[PDB]
């Protein structure tokens with residue numbers, strides 16, 4: 421079957437090459453995302469663990485940003501080899517909340533037959549864009565990956581969050597596609613909203629050395645979505661111990677201050693016997709942020725010193741920016757570690773400076789891109805990108821979800837690709 425990337429997988433190519441040895445296969449049609457002309461599919465989540473996956477999206481009628489929310493899909497299922505010997509996703513269980521207008525920022529963790537999905541519940545829109553008026557309310561659903569006919573609360577049911585420990589943070593919420601379980605406590609990528617006049621930051625920790633026109637205040641102002649924001653954002657994890665009587669709390673853990681950046685969508689995952697953490701770059705530090713997790717609680721991450729991977733921005737903080745500016749921009753494009761011995765990772769990235777376009781599956785190390793494969797056209801518009809890799813017959817496969825703009829219908833939709841990591845550098 422399909423299993424996590426653990427133990428001693430088949431060899432992969434380790435050399436920088438321009439040979440086309442990556443051969444992505446399009447596998448969207450196994451999920452309900454091929455879509456209908458007058459509908460936009462937005463706000464996707466994909467998560468994978470132990471032969472299962474959780475998937476979520478919102479469908480809007482008309483406009484992609486201001487359209488009417490038709491339905492929120494939350495499904496789980498299994499990753500299975502089609503006869504082809506190629507992995508693909510198959511739903512087994514799907515749920516829709518009663519009110520699709522109010523669910524935001526879902527995040528999934530798998531544990532022993534069930535996926536847990538933590539979401540924000542808001543009556544004032546995306547909580548990030550109006551945080552003062554957001555109530556801070558949360559919701560968690562449990563889905564069985566193996567539905568059992570008329571299974572009452574086994575198949576689906578919601579859990580009650582009657583206690584949130586958030587220390588000195590006003591509000592706390594899930595903020596990233598997926599997390600990890602730890603026999604058997606759950607950890608969700610999350611973010612904390614700290615009242616700005618409580619943020620202890622020493623401006624003399626802001627790298628201005630040969631950054632022309634970069635005031636040392638910039639690193640503190642950029643910790644909120646706006647230089648005058650009431651809150652600043654701090655990434656971290658939400659802990660949820662399943663073995664806590666009957667009302668397990670949720671405890672916020674903040675990310676350490678090494679290479680601090682405004683809280684943004686993040687991800688924690690298990691690769692080869694140890695957890696990795698990825699944090700999207702939504703401000704001035706535009707080089708990819710991920711690394712082995714030194715310790716989970718408290719959270720400290722051994723950020724890689726990657727010099728080749730970045731992400732497109734706008735005028736102020738374009739791709740490859742490293743100088744402290746005041747900005748809130750960027751895109752979520754994560755990377756999955758596939759070989760620790762050599763620290764090689766795979767991800768889909770947008771190969772452009774100031775426009776979100778040209779999605780390229782790329783395998784890479786800290787200072788070298790080894791090889792790559794265009795996923796669409798060089799002026800294809802794209803956004804969020806979520807990669808998970810695993811084993812199929814001891815061979816490493818990755819599955820990437822990529823938000824692509826469809827020029828026919830003028831709407832975005834998730835495309836799924838399955839990519840085998842080449843076991844040799846010649847075709």
Ligand SMILES: *[C@H]1O[C@H](CO)[C@@H](O[C@@H]2O[C@H](CO)[C@@H](O[C@@H]3O[C@H](CO[C@H]4O[C@H](CO)[C@@H](O)[C@H](O)[C@@H]4O)[C@@H](O)[C@H](O[C@@H]4O[C@H](CO)[C@@H](O)[C@H](O)[C@@H]4O)[C@@H]3O)[C@H](O)[C@H]2NC(C)=O)[C@H](O)[C@H]1NC(C)=O
Nearest residue numbers: 542543544545546547548549550551552553554555645646
């Ligand atoms: C995120 O969160 C909150 C929602 O809780 C939102 O605040 C609300 O925003 C709307 C503005 O879009 C505002 O409604 C407008 O209010 C003014 C009257 O202003 C004052 O009246 C209230 C009565 O007690 C008082 O409580 C406050 O002092 C309030 O400031 C009104 O002039 C507007 O009407 C406009 O003109 C035409 C008239 O025909 C309307 O038909 C049309 O709808 C117009 O918008 C409008 O009603 C509302 O009062 C705010 N709610 C409160 C509690 O403050 C934030 O705006 C939002 N923040 C972000 C970044 O999105």
Ligand SMILES: *[C@@H]1O[C@H](CO)[C@@H](O[C@@H]2O[C@H](CO)[C@@H](O)[C@H](O)[C@H]2NC(C)=O)[C@H](O)[C@H]1NC(C)=O
Nearest residue numbers: 677678679680711721722723724725726763786
């Ligand atoms: C990346 O570079 C730093 C500095 O050379 C390495 O050492 C520590 O890294 C962390 C992460 O940014 C810093 O917060 C510490 O101050 C560094 N300690 C020092 C000065 O030795 C780090 O190990 C490198 N990461 C990699 C790729 O292993």
Ligand SMILES: *[C@@H]1O[C@H](CO)[C@@H](O[C@@H]2O[C@H](CO)[C@@H](O)[C@H](O)[C@H]2NC(C)=O)[C@H](O)[C@H]1NC(C)=O
Nearest residue numbers: 727728730732738739740741742771772773774
């Ligand atoms: C996209 O942005 C990058 C970063 O500024 C540009 O690449 C740099 O181009 C300058 C030209 O002065 C070189 O000195 C640097 O070495 C480049 N940085 C690296 C290592 O990539 C790039 O040219 C931009 N794309 C364009 C031309 O629009």
Ligand SMILES: *[C@H]1O[C@H](CO)[C@@H](O)[C@H](O)[C@H]1NC(C)=O
Nearest residue numbers: 620621622623624625626636
């Ligand atoms: C950090 O440095 C700045 C400037 O020297 C200072 O304001 C601050 O007090 C220092 N650290 C602390 C908390 O003492």
